[PDB]
Every structure is written in structure tokens, then in C-alpha cells.
Design a protein around this nucleic acid. Structure first.
Ligand SMILES: [Mn+2]
Ligand SMILES: [Mn+2]
Ligand SMILES: [Mn+2]
Ligand SMILES: [Mn+2]
Lengths: 745, 745
DNA sequence: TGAGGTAGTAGGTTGTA
DNA sequence: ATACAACCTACTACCTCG
DNA sequence: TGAGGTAGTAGGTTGTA
DNA sequence: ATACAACCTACTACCTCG
């Protein structure tokens, strides 16, 4: 079969134990906690010792050769203690830091083209490479002609076993930067009005946007009583303004909004942020050029990390440590266990389907009851476009028709739609002011001949005249009428296109219309393992000090939604309080009792991220009710990527392919072919449970393959995925009594 | 008439300009901002100069005699600059700080009983007095026999005019403290299990509760590797443990929960917090003894501040400055303007009412439509008590009956209640687990013969077997059935009492039942001034990092509710974002358009607290729609209190009595007689508007006198008051479509 | 949580820079 | 890191309401 | 916002103490 | 005051779907 591996390189040769020099930090300042200063003390005494290696075990610093203990620092009185030879088996992290330091020190000495420093080292886990390995396996710089710079960003994280052998886990990424700040942009005469900027001179994390470009020079005395050059010389920062020429002093003051007040910052400091939007807006030839370099399949990631490890070479400071240039043949040698999960078979109307595409030729599993009356808002410029769009939607849904042609892929009467254009309402709304949009939606609900809305909003792009999605969905949220919004572009593709691209869009629209009115298109034949209900959980942070309420979806064992609950109070942080947990799981058990007459004997809780809560509360609440339960953390953001092997040819893994060790497991949920990127697998780990992980992974991969919003599978299981979508549609909840209508989809 | 005054004393004699010594602070540390350190530098160099006066103008410190500039401080390099004589007219705040410093320095020198320091000075605006002036005008200490200490807390805030005369604004308050920490409590053998505590040795603001009392001595080496006495000697705090005897070292370690981890703190540090609960639980004779001393009418506040000013006496450091012992005869001499607002006449069913009590003999203004069917949950122990309670409620509401006796204060058919005990449901619920309460409420709504619930919850006091109010109101919130909850105590008073106290309780219950089903009991005849709709606004902070959503009520000009809106997203801080403002005022204008066919030509916005928002957004939004608007900040917490004068006899003012200067005005909204406390007036100020303040105060006092939840007036206007109650009932909003049913009441 | 007011305790948010 | 000033909030007593 | 995946950028929360 | 580590979120490109 196709064995699996991760982005890891076995180190030939082992790390011998080294002579360490142990240091001591005490809280000399007005504080006394060494733990609030210990990493900063490491950084300061590391940089002040010509970047010689400085380590951290819990309070004891370590160096590899002799450094004088420093009393010059105001906050930390670092002192020598002893010299010793620490064993590996108690100090895994320290020897890992040793290996990644010596990798950083070998990669500073590596030059490309004989002239240029290849890797930008800051002696950390991150190694920026100034040049990239291309698809054609040639080290070439990628700079735009507008100075935009692409850099291949590496994160090393080596692991040393108890014996001393080294396993180097790599992860490669891209980076956007530029060598041109606002000073060279105004020297080029470019307009920076309204750009977001990142001031390179301060570590202040925040989003700064330019207000204007003042006519005042940076050397002239400003509104603060002094010039900005004098302002930086007063702040012990005259070194930044020391090398300024007269032409540098002719610079225009660029005032910048800084989330509390208009700052006045000089343009030699402010590098413009390189968003993907910014690359697309300013150099779209370069921006579309690098989609083969940013999005990487497993073969090109293996080639990039192969070039990286060949750049490392032998490390003579660790007993001639040299890494292999190949991945592992199998992760059983790494301690993982691998496999492919069987595909979850689905049910439609008249039986099993061999993919998600056959269901419009088969019919949906659970119809809703009763007629649904379309009633559509449309912008007044886009009349015939909207009419042809709803014509295509009604042809697909009710009449089984496509372009006026009956089609063998589609059965008649998919949804019992009562839409007659002679009797329906096509309310037209002026694009413009927001209260006109809200009055337009209330004007559509001023009639009783509508049960569903297919309102045409303008595009979510095109920042001009105001979008209608948010006011429409807020009003239809208050009125409890479900609605499937369509952008103008999709309406124009329904009107104008003659290909099956409109068939794809119409598939996803009709699945949305079905899911919003309570229908269920397809269900699982048999879920694997002993389970009665799946419960999702997620708490998302929208902005600073914001937390989305702990939205929890509840599924049955066949995967259809039972109940979702949003607590009306916002909670403190992404740990859930026990009051909110009690309310959520009371809704869980009462909803499953309402649909099936008993408490569920087995719960699998998928928590999106960290299950930070009291496990004792869960033990209490499901021990007083005799419920076995499982908490399986589904985690999205993971730098680990999974590969495949067929006679050594590294390629992207199939959907449903996984790796497993103990109580954590990574699983590829989506089939992405080459020239589109790598599969970004989930991190799935069990914080508490008594089920084996093969069952929990089969359950999660089954809850990925039953996303009822699209003909293609969701990466997330729809437990955490639908919790995430309720967190996105957090202001769009239907006001009236909570149903199984998947409004958020 | 009865003139008005505030708690202010005119200073006989004026402050001459003084010779100031000006200092300079620079950011010597790793920061450079003087503004983040300037007050701490003032405090440090004030305490290090034997508490000689140290002032703050924006960055320039001032002293009154010569102090050597200090370089010993690590963070601030304070330096002498110059000696000068500053004028008062540019330095109001500095001479105010001078006057309050010399008041602190005179009051340190004042002894009571010839022996004891009367006032506990920390050289600030707060002056704790160790003794109290009693009701009988005798300076007597108030200590419990359990060591609980009552202290009369004074806040001085003198104001100097441009000429130099001093006006001393006083405010007196009470204080709870004790001289007995956990060490003397365990020496007395008292149980401290579960108490909240305030550790006196750290400035860390947080709520600490005791877990247990360990058998480990504080001198024995603890779980941290060292003893706690060694832990405090390592933290430069051996002075706190220096004077410990052997008996002090026999102390038991009292571990304490500290919101992240169990701290281990020694009992000589932890003073127990003196809540009013704690005084009531431990010394209820003392706790009920001091309700004449804490709650102060205006006469006793005038006597207490008279004793305070007589304790100040002459100040020879300010040209023999001496204060008067009397208030002002009128606040026109202070620059305010006073008066009493006319009482807003009300409408019932058959005409005007002369108070709120006549409406049950008159009938309500707006009935609801259709029968309301009571259906009641009751705890199973309290069957006949609940039956007699609902009997009294149904007798009052439908039959006009009281104790089986028709009464001239009550007209028949107050609410069209269809409650027949032979046909209704009395569902009984077991006191206990919370999901049983939720299943009990869903079991009551399993029938369709109920439109309103009068469920009997257990008491909100009595921490034992779990309360039912929160699960009941959450379930009836989801199901959109309004419900008037009644505690067991009020049910027992309905069952057992024969007096008119049950008539009072039944008044407020029937007003609640009317308000929850959409009825409006009484409305204003004519609101004063040009106004079409009142809009409330409030954003409350529940806990750390929590913000209640920006709940906004909308009233008409007659005061009945139109619409309330809760944005489903929680916002960042108690400033409202412009997105949320646009959504709120779109609901405002569309709701008033739905009820009256046009946009309102005049809006008076009552914002609870600070109108921190973009005034430019309001100018934009109501200039593009041709709406004059007013933002009148209604502010609750105010230390200022208002008095009255009748031949010098100071007494509490009537409700609707106000003082006014410019764009801020204080107004007494409630008539509180003597022996019950002082009226706590609103602070009402106009951040933007074009109405005179007499009109806005008449509007606010009219919106206090039409609270439809009680027979006695609300202190707040019900704009900010009902916004506050929706913030309290933030998880109790009815799920279904938002109506004018005042659910929160 | 009959309703509301006074009164404490604790704890935040925001401005003022 | 810091700190008062106005403002808030919650929780518990007490007290009263023809 | 047809739907979803990859990919960047920025920015938080929480633990680990 | 501090800082990385795993985790998140939002917003914009690109790309593809019988
Ligand atoms: Mn999330
Ligand atoms: Mn959708
Ligand atoms: Mn509030
Ligand atoms: Mn109530």
C-alpha cells in the first residue's frame, strides 16, 4: 500500500552529553518573580554575549562555553553556579535547543550564489531563507520589480530521544516582506493614502493605518513642541536618525491612525504591510506567479526540505551530526501508526449513493413538510439577471430542469417549492443606505406569501456601495425566515453561462436551501463505534476582549443536527464556565430526550481547540446521569503536514488518511491533488475518553463527509465546523424558537 | 419655599499665592513615558520626604518647602528646576490639592478623648475617622465585641475660585473594617472555612476565598521547598515576619483560592473581608444597630460634616483659612440653579389618577387582547401555600377580590385572566437538580392551555437546595411564554397574612403580570418639551472581560415601550462601536415608523453613564435623515447629595427636586423620609443637544414616575433603568419575535 | 425572584498621556 | 510596569409600601 | 455572500510560573 | 513590566467543483 510519513529527518549519529555552564537568575527589580523575566533575561544575556548559546531549563540558564555573569542588567542579577555534564534523559528540551542552535549556526555560514547570505538567522526555531527552491529545483530569489519579497520560511523543531539520536521535524512556509518602506515609496511618488502599515522600529503589536501625508518636514518642529527627529533623539533612539542625509531630512511627516489617537511617525520607519491583497493590487503578475511556490504539494515540500537539510550538512559540534535527506519509509519507525479510514457510505432517497453528486439524481433523504414560497429581494439594476437566476434555481429545485432541458443527473421535485412568478413578489431595493435595506426586508415580510428568501446581495468584494448581506440576514434573523443569499456575480453566471459551472453553483445553492428549511439531504448508514450523540463546542475570539458565546451543536449518531444552543451571556475567555456547561449539556440531554425518549448512553464531545474545562465537572454531570462520555479535541491550525510514499515518490495523501500515536492523531480530511497545495490535516486528541482512537477518527472523518452544505466535504467535522459557522453567523441566529433548521449554512 | 443646597462649606478667607518649588521627571527606565510613572513618582518621593506635600501639574511636581531631588529611584530621575509663585487662575487643581493637603495636616493633629488619633490620614482626598458622630451628636467609637469596626469615611474635594476663595465640597460615608485577622480568629477558634479574605500585605486586587486550614505550621518547610516565613524573607519582606514570637510561629497554614491556583498564605496576613453579610451573620445586634448610622438623612449628614469642619478649624498655613459651619442658604451663591419639577400627571382607564395607588380602583390604560391562561409550577412541599397564593392573584386580577371580600380599592376585571383550577395545570417539581427544573418547565409547556406562568421558585436567599429562577426563566425565555416568578416567602405571606402587606405585594405582582403580557397600566398625559421618542442605552460590565451587549430601549413620547434591541455580538468595552449604533438606531427609527408612520422628528437619547461614542457618527446618521436629537447622559453613582432648608433645618428633599448649572444637573428622583437614608440623586448631563435642561430634567423625572413595574417610582428614568434591567435579564430575553411585552420586569 | 430605595463590601472600564 | 476619577457592575443586608 | 480547500498577513487567549 | 507554543480568529487573494 501507500505508507505514510511526516516531515521529519532522522539524524545519523547521536548527540553526546555536553559540558554545560549553569546560571542563576534572581528577581533583583521591584518584582521578585524570575518566571516573568526569565526568557527576557535569556534574550538580553544572549544578545550581549555575541549570540553565544543561552538556554532555559525551568530557572537555570545554560551556556556551552564560558561567559562572564552579568550584573549590568537592571532587572536580573545573573550569576554563575556550576559546570556539569547533564544527561539527555532528564533534559530532552535542552538538547533539542542545542541541536536547533547548532542548525542555526551552521545555516548562518551557508551562502547562495557565492555572495548572498542564504538564511536569515535570528537563532530561534524560525529560519527565514532569502532564496527559494523553485519547482524546477533551482535556488532563485523571488523579488518583484516593485520590491516585494517572497521568502521560504522554515521552522525547525528537533527532538532527541533518551539514547541521543536526533529526529528533526521540519515545516516550511512562505513569507511576504519588502525592502521598500514609505520613504522610498514617496520618493517614487506612490499613493499611500489608506494603507495599513507595520512600523519596523517598535515592537508594538497593533494595526496602524495611514491617515494622510502632511506637508510638514520631519526636521521642522512639530505640534508636540519638538521635531520628530528631536522626539526620537529624546527617546534614546538617535541611532535610528543618525545616518540620515539631508535628503532623508526632506521627508514628509506621515500621520498614522493608531487605534487610540493619530500618531505622527516618520516615513523611514514605516514598512507597508504585505497582505495578499497588497500583492494582488500592486503586482498581480507576481502575485499570480507565486501560487505555485506558496501552495506546495508534498513533493515540492519534500524537495524544499531536502534542499534545507543539504544546506545543513554535517554539524561537527555534535559528534559529526548529519541528517538524512529522505523521509521515513513508515512512521512505525517514528512511533506513530498509520492507515486509511474507510469511506462512510451515505443514504439518499432511494438508497446508497456512490458519491455526493448522485443525490440530485437520487433525491434527498429527509424532505421538509409543506410548500416553501420563494420571495426575493434583488437590486434594481439587476432585474433580468436576478429573474434568470431564480428561474434556474426554481428549475433545479422544483421542476428538475436545467437550461430548459430535463437532465439525467437531476430528478424532479427536489424541494416542494411553491414559486409562481405571476403570484410571487420580486421586491427591488435601492443599493445604498442600510436602513433602506432593512426596510426592504421588512417590506418583503410585510406579506404572508413567503416562507423562504433567495435575496440577491451585491458582491462581498467591491468595497463600494454598501453590502446588503448583514442587514438582510439581521432582519431575516429577527423575523425567523430562512434565506439563501446570492451575490450578483453568481446571479450573472446563472444568467449568462451555458456550462456546468452554474450546475455546480446551483448544487450548492439547492443544498443550502434544503438545509435552511429543515431538510436533511444525506445521512450515514452506520456510524462506527458505540455512540448516541455528538456534541460540538467552540469559543472563538472575534477581536480583543470579544468572545463569541459558547455555541454548541448537537448531532445524533446518524449525523443530522438535533439542537444548537447559544448562551446569551458572553463568557470570559475560551475556557467555558460550569454554568454555561450546565446550560449547554442540559440542552443536549433534553433535546436528545425529546427526539428519542431517553438520555443518550454515549456522548462524543468534539471541542474545537483545547478542552480547558473542569474534567471534574464532566465526571460529576455525566456520573450523576449514568452517561459514558468522550471529549475529543478537534484542532484546526497545525503546522504538521502528512505525506505518502510509492517507491519513494512523495505525494499528497488521500482524504481519510491518518497517523496515530497514543492519545493524539493527525488525519487528512480532504483530497487535494497536486498543483493546489498540501492537505492541512486536523490535530485530533482525546483529553478524556474510553474509546479507542481508530473509532474516534472514523467518527470525525464521517462527520467531515456529511457536510450538508456542499457537494464537497468539509475539512472540519461538522461538530466543530458547525460550531465555527454559528460563531461566524453569531448575529444571524433566527429569533424564533430554535429548530433543526441549519440557518447558518 | 424650601431652598436647596449641596454638601459644601464656604471658606472664610482666601488662599494667597504660595512659593512653589518645581520639579522635573524624565523616563530613566527602559520605558520613556513620564505619564505612566508620574503619579507613582509623586507617591514615592512624597513618602520618602517625611510626607511633605508633593503635587502634580501635568509633568511638573511641586513642593511647598525645600526637598533634595532624588536619584535613588530606579525609574524616575526627579530634579529641581526652579522656585516660583504660581497664580491661582491657571492652577485651580494645584491650589485645591494645597487646601486638601493642609486639611489632612490639620486633621492629623486632632485627637478624640485626649488620647486617640481621631482621623486616619493618608494625605489624600479620603479621611477615615476612627470615631463617629452619633445621632445624639456625641463622638463615640463604634466597635463590635467581635472586633468589627465602623468608621465614618470622609471625602474632601475643595475648589478654589479665580480670586482665591475656597469652597469645600464634602461627602461622608461609612466604612467596615476589623482589627482581627485570621490569626486572632484561629486563636479564638472560629471557623473560617469558605470565607472570603483580603490579604493586607499585597496590593493585588482580587477575590480570595479560603479553602481550608492546614495542620502544617508556617515555620515548617512547605510544599514549595521552603517554609512560608523563608518565602517572605526571600521576597525582601522579612520585616513583616521579624516581630513574630514563638506563638506567632505556631500558626496554621491557611491555603486560599486565588482565581488561578491555591495560594498558601500565612494567617497573620489575611484580614477577613467585612461584607454586610458578614456583619449580619456574626454580630446581628451590631449589624442592625448601625442602620441608623450608615443610612444618613440630610440632617445627620449636616451634623457629621459640621463636626468634621469644626475638627478642621483654622488653617494658619493658608492666611488663617477657616471654613463656615453651615451650608449655603441657596446654591445661586454657588453658581447652581434650583427648583422642583412639577409632578407628571398620569392616565388610567377612566381618567387621571392622583397617585399610582388609585389605578386598581380605576383600571389600567391599555389592556392586552385575549385571555391569558395561568399555568403554575410549584415546589411539591408547598402545595396549599401555592394554591392560596394563586387564589389571591386570581382574585386580584380577574375577580377584583381580596381575601374573599370585594374591596373598594380594586375594580373587577383588571386583566382578562382565564384561570379555572378545575381545568388548569398545577405542575409540581422536585426541588433539586437543575435539569429536573428545565424538564418541569418544558413539561408545563407540553400543553397548549397556558399563556402565562406564575411559577413559585424557592427563595433567592437560603443557599441550600438549588434555586429555580434561572432555569425556569431560561426555558420560558426559549419558549416565549412570559412568567411572573414568586418566591416561597411571598407565597407564604399570601397564604398566611391577613393585612394589607399582601395587598402591596399583590399590587406589584399584578403590575408585573400586566407588563409581561403587553399591557400598559398608566401613561403620561403630556410629556414636557418637543420630543417624539426616548431611546435608552447602557453597556454593563458583568465581570472581568465581560460586557453586556448594548441593550437599548425605545419609548414613545407618552412613555410606553416600543422596542428593545440586544445585539447578539458582545462589544469591546462600554464604548459602542458604530456598527452596533447603526443597528440600534435602525431598530429605533424603523420601530417608530412601524408604530407611527414616519421617522421621529426628535429623539432624546438617555445614555447610562458616559456617551463615549463618535458624536460625528450621530451627526451623520441624524443629519442624513433630518432628525434633531439629544444625548442626555443619566449617571447613577454620584457621591454628591442634595439637601433642603426651612429656617436652616436641613432635611431630605422631595422627589423631583433638582439643582442645575449649565450642561450638568443633579436631580432627586425619590422621596425618602428621615430614618431611611438620604436621597441619592442622579447626575444628568447633556453631552449633545439643543434643548434646555429644565425640559430634559422634566422628561427624565417623568420617565421615573412611569415605571410600570411597581406602585413606587424608579430612581432611574426607565430608559436607562429598563436598559439596566435588560442587562440584568440578559439571558432571559424571550426567544421569539421581539414584542412590546416588558418581559424583564 | 412582589417592588423599590438606601447602604456596605469587593471588582472592572475608561479617560488622562 | 502605574493611579486616581468618575463612572460602572454584583452580591449581601435593612427598610418600607392605602 | 454558491460551497469548500489551501495559502498569506495581521492580531488575540492561555498555559507555563 | 515578559515570551514563546499551541492554539485560535479575520480579512484578502487563488483555485476547483460530473
Ligand atoms: Mn472557532
Ligand atoms: Mn450560506
Ligand atoms: Mn448599566
Ligand atoms: Mn419581576
Amino acid at each position: 500500500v501507500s505508507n505514510l510519513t511526516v516531515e521529519a529527518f532522522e539524524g545519523i549519529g547521536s548527540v553526546n552529553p555536553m559540558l554545560f555552564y549553569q546560571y542563576k537568575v534572581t528577581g533583583k527589580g521591584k518584582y521578585d518573580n524570575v518566571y516573568k523575566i526569565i526568557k527576557s533575561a535569556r534574550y538580553k544575556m544572549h544578545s550581549k554575549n555575541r549570540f553565544k548559546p543561552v538556554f532555559i531549563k525551568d530557572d537555570k540558564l545554560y551556556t556551552l562555553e564560558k561567559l562572564p555573569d552579568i550584573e549590568d542588567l537592571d532587572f536580573a542579577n545573573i550569576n554563575f553556579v556550576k559546570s556539569e555534564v547533564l544527561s539527555i534523559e532528564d533534559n530532552m528540551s535542552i538538547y533539542g535547543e542545542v541541536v536547533e542552535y547548532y542548525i542555526n549556526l551552521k545555516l548562518k555560514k551557508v551562502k547562495v550564489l557565492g555572495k548572498y547570505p542564504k538564511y536569515r538567522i535570528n537563532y530561534s526555531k524560525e529560519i527565514l531563507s532569502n532564496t527559494l527552491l523553485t519547482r524546477e529545483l533551482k535556488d532563485e530569489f523571488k523579488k518583484s520589480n516593485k520590491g516585494f519579497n517572497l521568502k521560504r520560511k522554515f521552522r525547525i523543531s528537533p527532538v532527541v530521544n533518551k539514547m541521543g539520536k536526533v529526529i528533526l521535524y521540519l515545516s516550511c512556509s512562505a513569507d511576504f516582506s519588502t525592502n521598500k518602506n514609505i520613504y522610498e515609496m514617496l520618493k517614487e511618488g506612490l499613493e499611500v493614502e489608506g494603507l495599513a502599515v507595520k512600523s519596523e522600529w517598535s515592537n508594538i503589536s497593533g494595526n496602524l493605518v495611514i491617515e494622510s501625508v502632511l506637508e510638514t518636514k520631519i526636521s521642522e518642529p512639530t505640534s508636540l513642541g519638538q521635531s520628530l527627529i528631536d522626539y526620537y533623539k529624546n527617546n534614546n533612539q538617535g541611532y535610528r536618525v543618525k545616518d540620515f542625509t539631508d535628503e532623508d531630512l526632506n521627508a514628509n511627516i506621515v500621520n498614522v491612525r493608531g487605534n487610540k489617537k493619530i500618531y505622527m511617525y516618520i516615513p523611514h520607519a514605516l514598512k507597508p504591510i504585505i497582505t495578499r491583497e497588497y500583492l494582488a493590487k500592486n503586482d498581480p503578475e507576481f502575485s499570480k506567479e507565486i501560487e505555485q511556490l506558496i501552495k506546495m504539494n508534498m513533493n515540492y515540500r519534500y524537495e524544499t526540505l531536502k534542499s534545507f537539510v543539504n544546506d545543513i550538512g554535517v554539524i561537527e559540534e555534535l559528534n559529526n551530526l548529519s541528517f538524512k535527506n529522505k523521509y521515513y519509509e513508515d512512521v512505525k519507525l517514528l512511533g506513530y501508526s498509520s492507515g486509511k479510514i474507510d469511506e462512510p457510505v451515505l443514504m439518499g432517497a432511494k438508497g446508497i449513493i456512490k458519491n455526493k453528486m448522485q443525490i440530485f439524481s437520487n433525491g434527498f433523504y429527509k424532505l421538509p413538510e409543506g410548500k416553501v414560497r420563494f420571495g426575493v429581494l434583488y437590486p434594481k439594476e439587476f432585474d433580468g439577471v436576478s429573474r434568470k437566476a431564480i428561474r434556474a434555481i426554481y428549475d433545479f429545485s422544483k421542476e428538475g430542469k436545467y437550461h430548459g432541458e430535463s437532465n439525467k443527473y437531476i430528478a424532479e421535485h427536489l424541494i416542494n417549492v411553491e414559486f409562481n412568478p405571476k403570484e410571487c413578489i420580486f421586491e427591488g431595493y435601492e443599493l445604498g443606505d442600510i436602513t433602506e435595506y432593512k426596510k426592504a426586508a421588512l417590506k418583503l415580510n410585510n406579506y404572508n406569501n413567503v416562507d423562504f428568501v433567495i435575496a440577491i446581495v451585491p458582491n462581498m468584494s467591491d468595497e463600494e456601495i454598501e453590502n446588503s448581506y448583514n442587514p438582510f440576514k439581521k432582519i431575516w434573523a429577527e423575523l425567523n425566515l430562512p434565506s439563501q443569499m446570492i451575490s450578483v456575480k453568481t446571479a450573472e453566471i446563472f444568467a449568462n453561462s451555458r456550462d456546468n459551472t452554474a450546475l455546480y453553483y446551483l448544487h450548492n445553492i439547492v443544498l443550502g436551501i434544503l438545509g435552511k428549511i429543515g431538510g436533511i439531504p444525506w445521512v450515514v448508514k452506520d456510524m462506527k463505534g458505540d455512540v448516541d450523540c455528538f456534541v460540538g463546542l467552540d469559543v472563538g475570539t472575534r477581536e480583543k476582549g470579544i468572545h463569541y458565546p459558547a455555541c454548541s451543536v448537537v448531532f445524533d449518531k446518524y449525523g443530522k443536527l438535533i439542537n444548537y444552543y447559544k448562551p446569551n451571556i458572553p463568557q470570559n475567555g475560551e475556557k467555558i464556565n460550569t454554568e454555561i456547561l450546565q446550560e449547554i449539556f442540559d440542552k443536549v440531554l433534553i433535546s436528545y430526550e425529546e427526539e428519542n425518549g431517553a438520555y443518550p448512553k454515549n456522548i462524543v464531545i468534539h471541542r474545537a481547540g483545547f478542552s480547558r474545562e473542569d474534567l471534574d465537572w464532566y465526571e460529576n454531570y455525566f456520573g450523576k446521569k449514568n452517561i459514558k462520555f468522550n471529549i475529543i479535541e478537534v484542532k484546526k491550525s497545525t503546522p504538521l503536514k502528512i505525506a505518502s510514499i510509492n517507491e519513494g515518490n512523495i505525494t499528497n495523501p488521500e482524504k481519510g488518511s491518518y497517523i496515530l500515536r497514543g492519545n493524539k492523531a493527525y488525519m487528512v480530511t480532504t483530497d487535494i491533488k497536486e498543483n493546489l497545495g498540501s492537505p492541512k490535516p486536523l490535530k485530533i486528541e482525546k483529553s478524556y475518553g474510553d474509546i479507542d482512537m481508530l473509532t474516534a477518527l472514523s467518527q470525525i472523518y464521517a462527520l467531515t463527509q456529511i457536510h450538508v452544505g456542499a457537494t464537497k466535504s468539509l475539512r472540519l467535522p461538522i461538530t466543530t465546523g458547525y460550531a465555527d459557522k454559528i460563531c461566524k453567523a453569531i448575529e444571524f441566529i433566527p429569533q424564533g424558537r430554535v429548530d433543526n433548521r441549519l440557518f447558518f449554512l
